[PDB]
Subunit: 511 residues, 4 copies
């Protein structure tokens, strides 16, 4: 039982689907007497390859909490593993994956007298995480079984069941430049590529990618960073403002060239797409340019898993409701290797910036509430507390001004099983990327892919990188409707079902 | 500086605005091989009177916390009253009014390199709460100054400034049927219409409305219930299933006919619209039918001010994110007259039902998460605690199941200045009603108003009453996009700006 | 390495220890000019049997959450059972037992330059829970293994290890009078003594006790109620004001005679002591009198395990600090059989009263703060929420008035693993009882035991029953110092170590 | 109506009260076979001057939040000032002062059938804060009225009433060494003693003290630091290990000599006592020695006002209950000048250390719970958030291990009106100091005062400084019983009323 489109504007031929969408856009003009709004229409012609390509995913930090869990849970879902609990049994699943478990509203059906909600994955064909082949790299040589014991995410029973699958997996050696992460990671680094020549390093990872692509005969290769937060590099012309600059800096063995820069470069040069799950500024302008030039997609930055995903939806809801956030304070503590890394200042900066950034476009949205567009007091803390381990603790206070100088104070406590929050997002980023790799649209009689910097991934990310000269969009539910309208437009059935006027009017006969 | 539409589909003539909107709706067919989706278009032709009518608002419970505050704050905003605080000064405002302070997204402007957000009130002309003339009724004869001292909402200073405006106002006597509210209200009731003949009562309120409409020469009269929560009436044929039944029950002095039924009837019979701000089931089928027959709008039920407004946006965000709510527990305490009334069981039922109801359409939306469509454990408590007074305290626990049988627990504490939350919503309900009273659309060559049961008011209400045979919609942000798309459609400039594809594509030339 | 007393006031003879303690007590006289305080001394001569007696414990509700856990954990500690966790291993222990894990301050030692803290159990010899032999009764015939699966307290692994010990244990049939508990317990009751003759019931339990005492050759038998909260009986002369009244009511088959009354009677008549772990008013005056007459100890009421244990220490700390509690609101939810029973109103009353009672003696303690001795707003809620199961959730708000009409608000969230909180308290109540059964003191040349109503158990109990005509003492830390001073007085080494004046003075030579 | 002692051990002569107290102390000996405990008695002979001396208090940081509030509230209580609130009126008081509002338990009175609780201030005569004459110094010349507007503690109305009292008060100029506080304080410092000669500075403050003592004819002068947290000085021989060292360092104009060192020195040299309300290490060994030599009392460090006062009582309660704290996380945010100062790292260290220190003596108390005496994970955060101002927000998580490896998690939110918490403590420190200045005891036929380092002030302080070679005592309720036993011993009526054995025994005839 599939979901089948009936439209004069959709044509299947050759296992691709062509889909004409008329886009409604307002155009503006500022005049002495006020703002003139001209609604215009823009016919898009989409083609979508309907068969998902054979897909490999390469994780940097493959042996970490997220990495080993991402891998573990795929196996666990493939074999439908269960484990005993005090309550009975639990079973493997993919909850908290937008792609695997969100449903989408197509409208209302009179016959069944029902709102119609379909699984996201039924709209345009997409991968299941079961279809992802995964390798990658780690500065630690621990196999993915020891890696699970390290992480403390799966209950003991489930680690034992997963043992014959995870244990054989030992990550490839990686680039280690001690100066780009928390100095407390030295002890752990026993699986590193020899030498200090960064171009030999570049070539070594290139070599790693091609063989992976060959050895499994993959048609889509995605590389994704889920290793420790690096510090920021400098950004400047001479170093990394252009593609040719970044390539040259690698050739002459420049210092402000990170391990994460070299992976991004090795990925692009090999036609693999690259996702940045961490706060560092890997996707400098030189990199984006290099991706534009090589026809590959980039994404980032920084998983939006817990306290910020909430912040994202809550500050939107509050400004939409006519309420002025005055004070936002966000404490966090955790005891995993992620926290021990963010013990150090330059790494905590990477993360502080990306956590602090998500209420900018909202404060700018509303000049009644915010006449001077001044952000509210906004404070972001992360602390390393070994005891709670992977169970991060998000403690937040929101203070708003409401009607007649009254106040409304929300205090919040949020238990975030970080790895269990993060992994599904790793599956979604990979999955939406392969899908985007299958979409094209008419530019001028030839078909073109979307921009390289694939901002539609924003709902998954804290600090979204976006095509040059366009606005950042931080409010989660808004980022979700971008995604769900897009796939319905691809599939042939977008609508105005956010305003079901049929319910309070008599519905005009169809044209 | 107004907001000016430029469209071949919009025409001003005679101070009304005609607006053709093409509505995108999916139509469904269930077949052996799956679900067939046919996108169709429905041309709506709207007319919107552009000058807001002269508008009176009549509140039942005029002397209560909400009532006296609603009135107080209008005056306070008219005269721009300030009061000293430890911090400096505060000034009157209308924060927490969607209509007065929400902004709306029309799109992106290249020249200014900017997202375009306009005040809701700039899209189609609507009232300001300053333009509302307000009277009403109260079983307590206390003037609106003593009423402010009672309520304990405005700081002392602001009650003194408001004294020469509020003090002269003494509410009209009301219908009091002791058996429909908390028996603890007996002491307070010293301003009641004599007798036990309910038809004489009906006539007395009718008399009250006409004179108000006459005495201020009003073109729109809205009646709104913000008195104490009554218990539910029985519902059955013979009593109140039809209009003729409800009229007859009033004539023969039936018992299961509430004070709130008589107001609703007095309102409709006089061409005034009627809003129910409380949990009771005033708008029984007989009443809706009577409103349909008299060409008046009804609305309800129960202000969605605090803990439920949040619940509404948060459970949506969580199911959209691929997360299964397992347990929702909602405690509440307050010390105002609202709480003292909800001390009693039949009144607490009214409210419990409407608070508990808001996660039904969401659990039905997602059959991956909820295969058997079974709501999570859901518990709603309200307690009378004199000390906190109007400062209600909402304490909530949400427990969700996420990826791989992991859990995510959110604990929440929410300081809700109920009256300061509620009043702005009283201004919004009135205001959207008068606006709807100005909209018509083409049915079959003649123009018709929307359905009497005006469900577009849902964002303001906990337990929305909706046109017979159509689904309830509980998720706040979804209710807001219904409203903002509608007014943009009226004004001439609706769009697909929830998916700004211009940012990752080359924008096709306009057609 | 024992703890050895060196005193002219202590004598061992025959395995009992004689201990003379000089008690400092103020005596008062009210006069026109004020309050006259006369300090006097009272020499107590204690004898303490030093060898703990062979001890059986009989639980009513043996198959419940507390019961099966109490039993499980004894076995688990006897065999030093471990279970795997994500973190490593956990091992059996007795944490949260005052007797097994509190330490006591005897003073400061110059040689080691150290505060001297010894285990409570080192002061006077007391049982270990490993030395307790346990049987009892349950209306449910489920064996203690099925009983563990029911309760959901121990992790699966630990239930399997405990299986060959718990599985053979099937509780004796009990008295079931449907009318004294939540009607929702009918289904569960398949293990009941036949008939409606309450005197035959009385005799049947008597029979149960003697055989237990015989079959294990016990020198101390304690009976303890940890079955479902019953409602309150009436209290009146004719029924249960005296011992002879209560015996007669059982003979004539009176209705207001509870199952818990019959156990208390069967216990006393057989020389077993009786502890009431639940809210019901089992220990009516007739019962106390019967215990006085039979030389047995009674105790109750209601385990002080979680939210009330905290409340107890926090309200004391706050009134001692010069702070006026103004508002205390205490929400609770749980999903165990305890909660499902407290779903019903008469059972929730039992518990509401005992939870609400703990700030009386403190508000009376301070007439500066509380001139009119009026308790603050105090609200206690319990809700049945299946999902959280045994993991009760205590949500509290304390609002105090402080300096200059300022306010201080504490909001609290407390995860209470009820069974894990309760069981250790079952071990402490039994253990302090057997100890008290070993203490006597000089009345008038013959040695006497303490009063039957053993109030020293108060630290463990919410609603302490106390010898007639004496004050209730609710503040936990105060209840703890009663206990620790007493055992040091017994052992020979009490002190003024709450005021170690040696540290800021030159210490006078010993006398 | 006074409180009148009746004892053969108490004698009034010449307005002093002589009081013989027999102190019960255990003495220890470690032997092969175990611990031998020898209870001994130590007769103390106290003399207490009964008339409180005429008392001046000099505050450093007189113009701060605490300072201006401390002064404001004295006036406010002298004149019984009220202010309007939404609720009615509030009146001046001294809540949150232990000395002014704690009550003390002397025992039980049979005639009235009552526990006897008396005000602390009724036991031995002590000052009322109304009797304190207050001046001091501030680097800011703002008068105490502008100082109130700055602080934002009193409601506007109360600042106006206090205006003619506070406005005339302009603090004396102070020592400003920019390098000892947050560099962000430069702007504020417009009231400073000229020059960089620290000995001239020393002399200038000496001059300030003598004239204050002269001008009001004071018999007790107390100097108290409540200015901004300085950083720590170095500590070493050569600099400040001895009195002669510290005097010399001032003479030769040494750098590591703080402004707070010079005040402490100016105080001692003038026979004024000195209290340190802040985290810095003012009372280095050289200073204590100088106080010992000059027969003056010192106290510190750091007001224990809010989150730490609670921590202090809660960790005690939890270890006494047999519970292992595993994780303590303490977040704090505030927007006052205190927070803006603790923005900077060296100042935040001062405070972090003193907040983190309070669970040491408790973890050492219990080797069952803590076999290896390893403190739990313990994290202390302070953040500068302008918006909340003086309303600091304490957010805490306590995680304990309980019975059978179960866990208990307490999450806490605490609204701390810092200035309203702090000031009463300023009144208590001064007040207990003047009282101690009136107590002496027999050393060897002559009477001596207590040690200079007056540790009995500990209940008021976070990081108590104590006589060399004696243990720190951190648990609040324990610190309170030290104080209340001491004053009852002074007054003639100490007791064993923490164990009222009369209630479960027959009370032996008095000896
Ligand atoms: Cl799934
Ligand atoms: Cl406004
Ligand atoms: Cl143990
Ligand atoms: Cl007072």
């Amino acid at each position: 039982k599939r979901l089948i489109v009936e439209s004069p504007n959709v044509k299947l031929e050759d296992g691709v689907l062509e889909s004409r969408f008329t886009y409604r856009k307002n155009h503006f003009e500022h005049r002495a007497d006020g703002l003139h709004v001209t609604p215009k229409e823009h016919d898009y012609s989409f083609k979508t390859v309907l068969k998902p390509r054979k897909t490999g995913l390469l994780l940097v930090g493959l042996g970490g909490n997220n990495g080993s869990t991402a891998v573990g849970s795929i196996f666990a879902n493939q074999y439908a593993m269960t484990w005993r609990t005090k309550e009975g049994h639990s079973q493997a699943n993919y909850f908290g994956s937008v792609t695997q478990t969100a449903t989408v509203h197509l409208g209302y059906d009179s016959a069944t007298q029902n709102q119609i909600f379909v699984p996201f994955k039924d709209i345009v064909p997409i991968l299941s995480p079961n279809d992802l082949i995964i390798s990658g790299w780690d500065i630690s040589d621990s196999n993915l079984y020891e890696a699970m014991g390290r992480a403390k995410v799966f209950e003991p029973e489930l680690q034992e069941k997963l043992r014959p699958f995870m244990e054989p997996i030992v990550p490839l050696p990686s680039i280690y430049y001690p100066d780009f992460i928390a100095s407390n990671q030295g002890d752990r680094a026993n699986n590193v590529i020899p030498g200090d020549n960064k171009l030999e390093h570049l070539e070594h990872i290139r070599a790693d990618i091609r063989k992976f692509k060959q050895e499994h005969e993959l048609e889509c290769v995605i590389v994704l960073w889920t290793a420790n937060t690096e510090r920021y590099t400098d950004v400047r012309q001479g170093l990394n403002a252009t593609a040719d600059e970044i390539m040259e800096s690698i050739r002459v063995n420049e210092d402000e060239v990170s391990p994460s820069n070299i992976f991004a470069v090795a990925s692009i040069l090999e036609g693999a797409h690259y996702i940045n799950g961490s706060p560092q500024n890997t996707l400098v302008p030189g990199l984006i340019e290099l991706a534009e030039r090589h026809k590959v997609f980039v994404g980032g930055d920084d998983f939006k898993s817990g306290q910020t995903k909430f912040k994202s939806a809550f500050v939107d809801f509050l400004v939409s409701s006519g309420m002025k956030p005055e004070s936002i304070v966000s404490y966090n503590h955790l005891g995993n290797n992620d926290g021990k890394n963010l013990s150090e200042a330059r790494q905590f900066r990477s993360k502080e910036i990306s956590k602090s950034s998500v209420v900018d476009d909202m404060v700018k949205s509303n000049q009644i509430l915010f006449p001077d567009a001044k952000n509210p007091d906004y404070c972001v803390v992360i602390k390393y507390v070994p005891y709670v381990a992977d169970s991060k603790r998000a403690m937040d206070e929101y203070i708003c001004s409401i009607f007649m100088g009254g106040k409304q104070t929300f205090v919040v406590h949020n238990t975030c099983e970080d790895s269990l929050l993060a992994s599904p997002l790793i599956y979604d980023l990979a999955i939406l990327t392969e899908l985007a790799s299958r979409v094209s649209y008419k530019v001028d009689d030839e078909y073109k892919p979307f921009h390289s910097v694939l901002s539609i991934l924003s709902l998954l990310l804290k600090a979204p990188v976006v095509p040059p000269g366009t606005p950042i969009s931080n409010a989660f539910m808004r980022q979700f409707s971008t995604l769900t309208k897009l796939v319905t437009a691809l599939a042939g059935f977008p609508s105005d079902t956010d305003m079901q006027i049929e319910f309070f009017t008599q519905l005009p006969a169809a044209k």
